[PDB]
Amino acid sequence: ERYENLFAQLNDRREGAFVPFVTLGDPGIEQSLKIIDTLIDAGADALELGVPFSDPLADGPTIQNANLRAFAAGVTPAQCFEMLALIREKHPTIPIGLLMYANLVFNNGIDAFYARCEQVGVDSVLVADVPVEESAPFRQAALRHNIAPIFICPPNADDDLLRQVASYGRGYTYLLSRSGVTGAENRGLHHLIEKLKEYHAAPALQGFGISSPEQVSAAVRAGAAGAISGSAIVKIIEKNLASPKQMLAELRSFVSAMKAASR
Amino acid sequence: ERYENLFAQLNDRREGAFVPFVTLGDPGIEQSLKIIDTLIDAGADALELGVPFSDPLADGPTIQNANLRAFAAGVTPAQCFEMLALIREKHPTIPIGLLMYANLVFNNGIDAFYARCEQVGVDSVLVADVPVEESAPFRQAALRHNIAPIFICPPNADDDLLRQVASYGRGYTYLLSRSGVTGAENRGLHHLIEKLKEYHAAPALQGFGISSPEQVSAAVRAGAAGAISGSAIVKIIEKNLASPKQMLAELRSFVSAMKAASR
Amino acid sequence: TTLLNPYFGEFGGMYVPQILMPALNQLEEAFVSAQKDPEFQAQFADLLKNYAGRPTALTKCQNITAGTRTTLYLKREDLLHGGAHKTNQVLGQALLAKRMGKSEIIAETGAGQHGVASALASALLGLKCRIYMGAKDVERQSPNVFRMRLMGAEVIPVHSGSATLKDACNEALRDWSGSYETAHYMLGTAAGPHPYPTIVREFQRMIGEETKAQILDKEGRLPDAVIACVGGGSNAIGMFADFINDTSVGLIGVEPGGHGIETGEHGAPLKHGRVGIYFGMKAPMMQTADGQIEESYSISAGLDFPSVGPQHAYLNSIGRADYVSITDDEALEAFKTLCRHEGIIPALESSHALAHALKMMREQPEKEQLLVVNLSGRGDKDIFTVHDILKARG
Amino acid sequence: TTLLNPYFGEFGGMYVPQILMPALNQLEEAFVSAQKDPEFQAQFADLLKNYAGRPTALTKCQNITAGTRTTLYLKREDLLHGGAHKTNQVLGQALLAKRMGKSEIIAETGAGQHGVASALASALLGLKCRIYMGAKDVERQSPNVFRMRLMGAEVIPVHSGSATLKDACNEALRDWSGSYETAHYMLGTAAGPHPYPTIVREFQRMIGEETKAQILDKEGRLPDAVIACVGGGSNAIGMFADFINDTSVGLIGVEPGGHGIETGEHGAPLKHGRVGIYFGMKAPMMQTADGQIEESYSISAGLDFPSVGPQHAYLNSIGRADYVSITDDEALEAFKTLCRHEGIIPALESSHALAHALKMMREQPEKEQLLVVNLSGRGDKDIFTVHDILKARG
Numbered sequence A, B: 001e002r003y004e005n006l007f008a009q010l011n012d013r014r015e016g017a018f019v020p021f022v023t024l025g026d027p028g029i030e031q032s033l034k035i036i037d038t039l040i041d042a043g044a045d046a047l048e049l050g051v052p053f054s055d056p057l058a059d060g061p062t063i064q065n066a067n068l069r070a071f072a073a074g075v076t077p078a079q080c081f082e083m084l085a086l087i088r089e090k091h092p093t094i095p096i097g098l099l100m101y102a103n104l105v106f107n108n109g110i111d112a113f114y115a116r117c118e119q120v121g122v123d124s125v126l127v128a129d130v131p132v133e134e135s136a137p138f139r140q141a142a143l144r145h146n147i148a149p150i151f152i153c154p155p156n157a158d159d160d161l162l163r164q165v166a167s168y169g170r171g172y173t174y175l176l177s178r179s180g181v182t183g184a185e186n187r188g189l190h191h192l193i194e195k196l197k198e199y200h201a202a203p204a205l206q207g208f209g210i211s212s213p214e215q216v217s218a219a220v221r222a223g224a225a226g227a228i229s230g231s232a233i234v235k236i237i238e239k240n241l242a243s244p245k246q247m248l249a250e251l252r253s254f255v256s257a258m259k260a261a262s263r
Numbered sequence C, D: 001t002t003l004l005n006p007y008f009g010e011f012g013g014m015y016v017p018q019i020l021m022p023a024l025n026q027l028e029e030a031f032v033s034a035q036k037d038p039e040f041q042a043q044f045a046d047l048l049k050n051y052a053g054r055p056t057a058l059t060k061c062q063n064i065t066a067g068t069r070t071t072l073y074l075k076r077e078d079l080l081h082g083g084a085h086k087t088n089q090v091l092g093q094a095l096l097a098k099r100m101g102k103s104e105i106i107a108e109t110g111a112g113q114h115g116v117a118s119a120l121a122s123a124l125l126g127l128k129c130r131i132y133m134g135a136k137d138v139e140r141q142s143p144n145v146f147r148m149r150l151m152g153a154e155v156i157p158v159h160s161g162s163a164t165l166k167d168a169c170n171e172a173l174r175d176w177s178g179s180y181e182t183a184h185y186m187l188g189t190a191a192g193p194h195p196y197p198t199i200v201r202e203f204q205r206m207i208g209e210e211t212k213a214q215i216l217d218k219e220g221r222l223p224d225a226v227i228a229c230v231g232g233g234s235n236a237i238g239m240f241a242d243f244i245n246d247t248s249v250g251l252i253g254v255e256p257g258g259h260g261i262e263t264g265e266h267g268a269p270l271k272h273g274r275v276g277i278y279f280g281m282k283a284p285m286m287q288t289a290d291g292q293i294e295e296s297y298s299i300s301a302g303l304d305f306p307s308v309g310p311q312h313a314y315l316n317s318i319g320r321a322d323y324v325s326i327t328d329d330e331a332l333e334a335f336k337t338l339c340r341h342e343g344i345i346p347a348l349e350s351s352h353a354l355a356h357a358l359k360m361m362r363e364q365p366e367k368e369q370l371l372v373v374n375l376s377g378r379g380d381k382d383i384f385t386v387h388d389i390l391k392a393r394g
């Protein structure tokens, strides 16, 4: 119960969670692994990881390019699962969540996918292009393999959706900051946050557009159990492709700043 | 009665007539005048002259270019009539026939046109784009000014046309060698020639495609009172634009050869 | 003589070299016969409907007349197979060609719409088609050159003179004079020697007949005025024909004003020319004082001709039809207005008609008036031309 | 839940990010309501007829079937305003957009025919239109880019991926996910998340309804088979829809075979793909063993897509409809054959359908069969592309 233990501990220390996001294999397998260890050493409470997909329709340019880079390095889903195994072997308690696109999950069989997630130590799975309306087979497979199915609570969510997300979700609730696709440049909820807690929904993590410490503190202050940052992280990766050393340094610096803001 | 006197004399000498054609003002007024004197000195029995027209629809490239050249030299219809006056002033007995396009005749008034033809000494007028069907006002104006109206006898002429041409025409009958437009490269009638004589049509001159002595003799042998050659003449003009001297020499040589063939 | 009157008042006739009279006479006879032949009419109708797509729609323009008392309809000849009204009479002339046992077709073209129409009809009816087109037009109306070739037609560039419509016409006639036994000259407009102005009107009159029926059904009355651009005069007479005896209906022909009438660079002989004889007819001509036929001009290749059909000269003479001109710029503003506010891309030729209509509305916005503009063709062929001009302007 | 079944068997669904479900739900509700609204149907009909020019003709091809027992008719969607069947459902979706109070339009386009249709409808109905088009297609279907701009639409080149249809689709969806409150995504084919496959079929079914009425009146019976090219599946389902319950009528969809199926360079996921989830639907996808969506290929931009509408996947599954493929070369030979022997220049997309029909006739020339090919569009947009290829060959 990695998520349950994290939020319990965080609650005691009265702090929110900072969850960085990166695409596995960007810019390469080895460097991606170091990048993730740095994110954890820098202060990451949990991880949100993506698997390169040919058509990431919920992602803006930053993460699109992250996917392209991973593809240039020949990164495949199989290699992503080998990486997840290694990451879990080095960090036994950090909660690991995957952000997937439906075809990759459906490809070799939905159940087989979640069976593999369980085998490598994954804690949750969010399928970006599978709304609650199409979630049955995915949420069911997840639960059968002790994987928490993650659901998104959009800013335009009505009561029926709040309730569905509350009962179907496990681990954490992905609280969308805004409409649109992923992107750090686009910056985006107290009421929604309250309703979720009313319906006993898994703890809420805010995502999309979160790229500054100020935004982290704001989310926590508003009631959110934490925040997720992807594009902002990925941007540091692409700007430092030439200097891997300065890349990690810049990343550690940024993550620490984002995490401190959650205290 | 220039045409009547020519055919009478020619008949006695038992020869056919050679009638060269050139566009007035090509390549220029002065040179055109010399070209015509040479044609006459070389043996021309009568003249067939054209007046530069913007759209000579019955003419092929050779004469089209002749018209262009005359236009480059600024040759106008007024200047053409001044030339005709000079030509008639030097040659009192040679029959002069004009080959015109309807608009030039109709422009300042049909009657005024034929009045001017009579004033400068012109003997006949052939309007290329005026069939017998539209000829009334033209033939009438011509006769009123002692100008012979010339009609074409096409190779596809039926009996009604033979008869019309026979009674309306004066001077000579233009016997078409072939369909198409003027052109020396395109070489084209005994029955038609006979029918015309039966209906007492003005003497017949064959035209279009006549560019060799052989063709001249053939026309006369077939019964025609003579032949007309335009493009063949004009071609010598354009090939010798650089050497006016060799131009006239070449022309005299050619005309003599064509005329001899009519003996 | 002839079976039909070759004249419209003083205008018209058969001013062609004697050699072509038999061909003209044969064509007239074949036309008269075909007009009384049920089978011919049925075959013509079948092609127009099932092949060309007639009847064409009559579109009401609600957007461009907003805030005025002008109701404007567009006869959509732009939707006809091929893209212009030209296709109508070409199907009829092709049938006449077969009827006369001719296996080849000669045609002239400026906007290339008549060329395309001639090529497609020939491909469909088994005729060998050759098209004359001025070199300038080969360039400014290129999309159509490609279409013609693709359909098996021989396109022949004419570099003589102004390298435009007029010159293409000259070559077509020269060619026919030497091949009339096997080739039929499919003249593309209501001009030239009789019987062409008559044949072309009759094979285009469906435009006005449909326009009348459609306007009556949609408005319960006739138009205050039908407006059409005038090149040689086919789409305009095609639109006018059936309204001629309806005295209340204004007939407005719009000649190209080019860069403006005062510049001499236009194609408006009807209102700024002088009667002359050329291209087998006695009609208004843009001509010099000397009697030389001048070169015309217009941003639209289809209207770029120094003369006009004889019936238009006649209708103007007796005052039945009024003719005006529209400059390049006025046509362009109309072109853009239709594109952006009605979602229809009109041919630049048609745009001249639309331009006048828009003027009639704008000048007297409170005048109640029902107008119909013959949208003779679509402007796909004019896209590159219009783009380059609008680019050099921003 | 939803008001209508989002699936056709196992294919279909609404696989989009949660943020877009309200927009999809709103669209479905608006569509259902509009379908029971007499005023909406009347307005739709009015636009289709008086603006678009429906009904389109059904042309019999006597020349190309000579010496065989094959009778072939062509549904002339190429005569529709805009030049392709695309215009039909765009008029309907535009009305739905207004009905929903949306003032902007997002559309993707490959052949540019949907882009042009979206632009003209928006110009006519007062909507701000922006179109996504792959850069490769901006080039090979350029005539349409010009048309779109001229009508006031913003054309946005997409350089990502294969720079073709698929990529234009991706961008359109990304854009909509962030602007659905003010913009309506006018998807151009019978694919994507429900309710689009249903809406697009319904707003295109007039093709088949008219085809049935026209074939009955001309032949007294139904077709042995209706044939249409299949990109996303709109013109094909539009043609098929009304014949589905007529069990004797063969439904043949023609997927692009590109350079040949064995080369992997094609757009035939239906018969050579594997079911997957992408572009909001569970449907056959050309995809790697890993589950990555592959890039498709086809000489015709309109068919260059790695997936297909879910209803086609379903109809094929139960065996109601048969799907085949036609290579680039086969489509080109059909394109030229129609141009030269029927005088119609077909879109390269439509040419794939015609190619199969010609194969069906040639392979069994003594087999008596009545066929109808949906000529989805005219090929004006393909002239330069075809010319360059035929030039490099002579």
Ligand SMILES: C=C(NCc1c(COP(=O)(O)O)cnc(C)c1O)C(=O)O
Residues within 6 Å of the ligand: C084, C085, C086, C108, C109, C110, C111, C112, C113, C114, C115, C165, C188, C189, C190, C229, C230, C231, C232, C233, C234, C235, C236, C301, C302, C303, C347, C349, C350, C376, C377, C378
């Ligand atoms: C001369 C040619 N076009 C004329 C044309 C015209 C002018 O010709 P009319 O004969 O006057 O109708 C009007 N509208 C369209 C769309 C046109 O294509 C041609 O296509 O060869």
Ligand SMILES: C=C(NCc1c(COP(=O)(O)O)cnc(C)c1O)C(=O)O
Residues within 6 Å of the ligand: D084, D085, D086, D108, D109, D110, D111, D112, D113, D114, D115, D165, D188, D189, D190, D229, D230, D231, D232, D233, D234, D235, D236, D301, D302, D303, D347, D349, D350, D376, D377, D378
């Ligand atoms: C993708 C586009 N075109 C598709 C198209 C197609 C294929 O799409 P369908 O949706 O399968 O009908 C067939 N025919 C014509 C003439 C076309 O333009 C487009 O215009 O954007």
Ligand SMILES: O=P(O)(O)OC[C@@H](O)CO
Residues within 6 Å of the ligand: A021, A048, A063, A099, A181, A182, A183, A184, A207, A208, A209, A210, A211, A228, A229, A230, A231, A232
């Ligand atoms: O990139 P962001 O900051 O918009 O976050 C969204 C995802 O990338 C992480 O879930």
Ligand SMILES: O=P(O)(O)OC[C@@H](O)CO
Residues within 6 Å of the ligand: B021, B048, B063, B099, B181, B182, B183, B184, B207, B208, B209, B210, B211, B228, B229, B230, B231, B232
């Ligand atoms: O040029 P030709 O030889 O065809 O003769 C025709 C005219 O030029 C003279 O009438």
Ligand SMILES: [Cs+]
Residues within 6 Å of the ligand: C065, C066, C067, C068, C069, C070, C071
């Ligand atoms: Cs109005």
Ligand SMILES: [Cs+]
Residues within 6 Å of the ligand: C230, C231, C232, C255, C256, C267, C268, C269, C303, C304, C305, C306, C307, C308
């Ligand atoms: Cs004109």
Ligand SMILES: [Cs+]
Residues within 6 Å of the ligand: C053, C054, C055, C056, C057, D053, D054, D055, D056, D057
């Ligand atoms: Cs129609």
Ligand SMILES: [Cs+]
Residues within 6 Å of the ligand: D065, D066, D067, D068, D069, D070, D071
């Ligand atoms: Cs047949």
Ligand SMILES: [Cs+]
Residues within 6 Å of the ligand: D230, D231, D232, D255, D256, D267, D268, D269, D303, D304, D305, D306, D307, D308
């Ligand atoms: Cs496809």
